[PDB]
Amino acid sequence: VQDFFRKFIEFQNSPNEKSLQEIVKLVGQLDLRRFNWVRDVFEDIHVKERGSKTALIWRDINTGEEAKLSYHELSLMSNRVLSTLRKHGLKKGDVVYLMTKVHPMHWAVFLAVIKGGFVMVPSATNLTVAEMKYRFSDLKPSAIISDSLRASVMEEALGSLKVEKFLIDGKRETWNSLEDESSNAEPEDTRGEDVIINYFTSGTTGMPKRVIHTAVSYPVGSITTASIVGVRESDLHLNLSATGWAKFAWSSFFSPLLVGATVVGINYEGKLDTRRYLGEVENLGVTSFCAPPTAWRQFITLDLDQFRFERLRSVVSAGEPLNPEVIKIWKDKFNLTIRDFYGQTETTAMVGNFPFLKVKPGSMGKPHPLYDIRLLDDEGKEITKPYEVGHITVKLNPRPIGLFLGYSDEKKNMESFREGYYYTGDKAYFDEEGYFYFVGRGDDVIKTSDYRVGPFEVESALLEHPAVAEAAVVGVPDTVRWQLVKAYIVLKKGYMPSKELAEEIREKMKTLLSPYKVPRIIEFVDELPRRVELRKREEEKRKKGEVGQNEYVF
Amino acid sequence: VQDFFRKFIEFQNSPNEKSLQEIVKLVGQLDLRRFNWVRDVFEDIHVKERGSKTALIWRDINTGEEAKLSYHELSLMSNRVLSTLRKHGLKKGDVVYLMTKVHPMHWAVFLAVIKGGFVMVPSATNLTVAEMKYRFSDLKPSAIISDSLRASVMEEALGSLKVEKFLIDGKRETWNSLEDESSNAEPEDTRGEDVIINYFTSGTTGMPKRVIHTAVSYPVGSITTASIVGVRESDLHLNLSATGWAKFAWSSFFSPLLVGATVVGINYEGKLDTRRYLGEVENLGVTSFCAPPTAWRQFITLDLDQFRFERLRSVVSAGEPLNPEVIKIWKDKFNLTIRDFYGQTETTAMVGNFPFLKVKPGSMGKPHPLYDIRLLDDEGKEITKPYEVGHITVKLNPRPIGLFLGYSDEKKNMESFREGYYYTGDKAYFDEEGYFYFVGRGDDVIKTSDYRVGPFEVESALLEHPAVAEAAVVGVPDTVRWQLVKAYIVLKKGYMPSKELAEEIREKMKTLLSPYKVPRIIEFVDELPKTISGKIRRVELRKREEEKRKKGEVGQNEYVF
Amino acid sequence: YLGEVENLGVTSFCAPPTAWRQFITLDLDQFRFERLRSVVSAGEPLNPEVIKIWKDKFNLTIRDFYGQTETTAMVGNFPFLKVKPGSMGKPHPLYDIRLLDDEGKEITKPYEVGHITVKLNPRPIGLFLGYSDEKKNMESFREGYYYTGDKAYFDEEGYFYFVGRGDDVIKTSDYRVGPFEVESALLEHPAVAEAAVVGVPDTVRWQLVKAYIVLKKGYMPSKELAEEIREKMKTLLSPYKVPRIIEFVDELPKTISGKIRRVELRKREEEKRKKGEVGQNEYVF
């Protein structure tokens, strides 16, 4: 039944409770034994029925460069990619690292990979030589693809491992172009359970592990997302997110292209300019906008009488909680509710405020009916009481569609999947109306600025500084970024705790760690205690507005 | 006046800002009305004080040959040249083409020319019969001097012009030896402003024209070079450069022999063997080494744990920008900074990271105080604000010493010498500390692989193919060679765009043009973007290439070789 | 030659792609070709762009078609058959043409590459008796099939596309060339210790004969040496066989067997082409 998508697309143009349930039931009747979302959905529905609709409107707010691509031109451009890859001897299942800015050719490559049945490893543009070498140790690349802005970082992290390398913008010695081949390569007949994506995600214990997604988990899971988001074919849909993560796939790629919408993509280097980006949203007449609460928190501090947003109809958030006061300010002004919704790299959207659902501020809504979401207590017994906190879990019989295969780590599978549930390692409570409220991680995992961060990874990099004897990294409350990365450091004898030392250590960490990971606070202490108790101690200090004796804030 | 160079040579052994300024002032007080650098510096300082020190160590990495000359033997050998020339009736001012490989007899001839007040025309060994015929049309030779490897090319380009011909290595019918007359002929009492060198260089407008250098401009301007380079009397100094250009007179000849150092010269035919050349650098214990970024880029790709370079203390680059990453790799390994410096055939070194100057990567350093260097905007007003790009210019009242006399082309003088400034046609910005950063050409001049290339010259050669109606040659970014030569060609009615045609045209170009000039890319187009007047917008051909690069596409009739 | 074609009013013209490639570079408004109705090519692939130029001008399709010394024409664009460019057309029904895979099973799928073979029961008529060499017959005639040693794929309409040789055989300028023959002649030169002869991509002649040479101790890799070797080879070898390039190397990349990886010689050539660089002692004539 590909008639599913045609029914789905209509559901979107005016959804409701009842018609949702039909969509749900119809997914259960899909044949997903052999599936390939590009062939079966992109080409067979969208390129065929609306080949000359605008698939992408792109702009770089720094350079000025702009591009407009129809579903046709994009399909062609993607085939040139896939032809070029195949020409360099890329078989199905081969590993392809992808590290580029927001750019048409990114979508292009996405398509080429999904169509060609490759394993793509999205890599963000801010990843360091060190972090990239880690990745290569864990999974070896058959091919890598970059922009010219980050070619040297790939080149250096590689050293001299044999790979086929490719540039999306410009030439460089021993890098290849992507459009020198044919505008038609044939689909790879993928099984639905075949692997197409690996995502390195941070966890509490170790260095980052791979999350494994299939030719259906994201390409068909995204339904749940698209349905919560309320993205339509008519829409111009902008998702403010970066290139090497799930949320790009989630909303910059799959959710819009599922429903045949116009994707809007905006690239910027460096720090977000909230008043120019928001102006470009209006200037491009986006109608559906996904942005992370970090962005939203910055937007509401603007003078909001600069903007009309005549065209803007749907507004959405994901990745962190959405302060009730943010929701309210944006509503009072533009008469739109910012609908928060929930998921992980491991999943698609699992819980969410749908378009037709009454929003309760600072609630992520209620479960999407395609996921069997349960709050369990410490014994793993199901919670049936308001205002009782517990573990967010996903029931595995029957196995929801958008759920990853598992981790590349067998220990981590043993912890997460058990007694017939996948544990998200998130905590929540529900209320008297069954609305879910995020409480936090049961882990020590951190989320600064909509980036998941592993403590041991930062502790590790910290011991690389000669001064550092011991280290413990925790997250500390911050209204702007949800949490800050703080490091407790025990110093070697010889170092005296100074501002200039804290800085020197931080600057070192910047060469080893992605910026979001580099501690914003460094506190030197005589000894370490129980990352739990580091947090508890911070809390009692907050209530007396007192700094630590050698706590240095950046 | 001799005392100048003795003060200079000391400055070198330990230089700084302040003592540089003293040097500057002292040059301004030299009496250079009648001057001859061979007599007055080579002979009177070096041959006299260090006659039996090694002036030159030479080595051919192909043949294996090594040969060593002292300041004396070289002075003698050069006099035999000058005696031999004079014997064949060469008066002052007479034109002498010099086309040879790296070889002692090259230095010899340099000397003989400077001493005898002749006009030498350095000619490169990869110049074609066609290129050479062009040269002869523009400046008729009184004598020509070659190695045996390139005698045929001169013989053919000559046709049946009367000239005296000479071989530096081996026998050939109707070619003469240079060492057969007595090693005793006298200086020509040259005016300091008398012409001794002509360099054919490419411009953005036409066929290549002669840059005119005097008995002081290079022989004494090279101070600026020597000073940035940081070459001493103690040093064994090697310059990776070719015979027919100005970088040779710069670091292979003048800069070392000024300070009484030992010159190191290495000859190779064909492709540079990076591992063998670097091995020969180490093996000969060179101490000062100047190579171009092209070379440097290639060196850093080696496994560099093969080398110690225990004897190397100075490393320098010039001719194109020097990637910060090159500088870094070489430093981390051998604990030396590759010091970038800037200039052109028309000048000596004008801007440079001197020995004592903290290097900011991707900056060519600060201006040498013997040139009055100014960034001007398009309207010709002086820029005094950081991070604003403009034209690099040289203020002409008073006229700096290392600056050429002008071009042999009056149109090109009209464009370069304007309102009391000479325009280099290079663009740059300076920072808050007065460090200069290269932006690129404001011309359409091209720089492949540290060779300056003229568009019209390649466009001309392209019209020689019956199929070609018009042509527009621009450079395209390339990390290995700075720029690639691309040609846009409009075809005559009757011929159709094919790869096979593109090739046929390129192979033709190979017989007419030096290899560096032969387009690496050929694109057929229906028309070339023009202004209202009908003038080609080479600018917009470049812009178009850029937009195509940023969506990783090659063109619909672009053929890459 | 094309002036003489027109002047004699030829009506059917076979020429090889080498010739065709050269013709299309002319100014073709010099000719009418009043009398010419059929144009055909054989022996190497026929570039789609060549086909098109000649068509746009004279309104004729150059029909490529396929075969070997061992056979007659086995596959071809017949006059009544719609040409798909860069396809040698469909099999002649008087040959039983089969694509077989590596295991020797018959290919039943579009866009799958394999060996062009001739099925031997019954034995087609234009097929040679065999070679005068019984070893070479044992290689070419196997498990009921004569192998052409060419590789191809077919499409959904049964049109064949040439992929290349399974062999190390070379075709410069529509002349089939044996490596060992040239390697042998090269060891005749005192200086030559080892030799590997490969074909390198060339638009004009399809492939160039290039020689990799390892030198005996004593001789130094020079242009003058390369030439001296080449001029010797001119007295021994038919011109088409005389290497157009000679590259001296320290060693030839080899398998565990000692067999030359002409594979990796080609891959290396490719990476060097993309930087328009010659090898350290590669001499092009």
Ligand SMILES: CC(=O)OP(=O)(O)OC[C@H]1O[C@@H](n2cnc3c(N)ncnc32)[C@H](O)[C@@H]1O
């Ligand atoms: C070296 C020489 O004599 O060159 P020459 O052939 O006369 O050409 C002169 C042109 O070289 C370029 N150039 C020279 N030095 C440079 C440097 N340090 N950084 C960047 N560009 C540099 C400029 O563009 C000049 O105008």
Ligand SMILES: Nc1ncnc2c1ncn2[C@@H]1O[C@H](COP(=O)(O)O)[C@@H](O)[C@H]1O
């Ligand atoms: N709407 C949300 N509210 C609160 N936490 C969220 C929300 N969305 C995502 N998260 C957190 O982010 C994690 C997933 O991060 P990532 O793998 O980067 O998408 C989840 O495990 C949650 O803890």
Ligand SMILES: Nc1ncnc2c1ncn2[C@@H]1O[C@H](COP(=O)(O)O)[C@@H](O)[C@H]1O
């Ligand atoms: N039309 C063609 N396209 C590609 N290769 C061809 C073609 N015709 C001949 N060849 C090659 O040339 C060989 C024939 O060699 P010969 O016996 O000299 O004609 C075949 O085995 C092919 O590999």
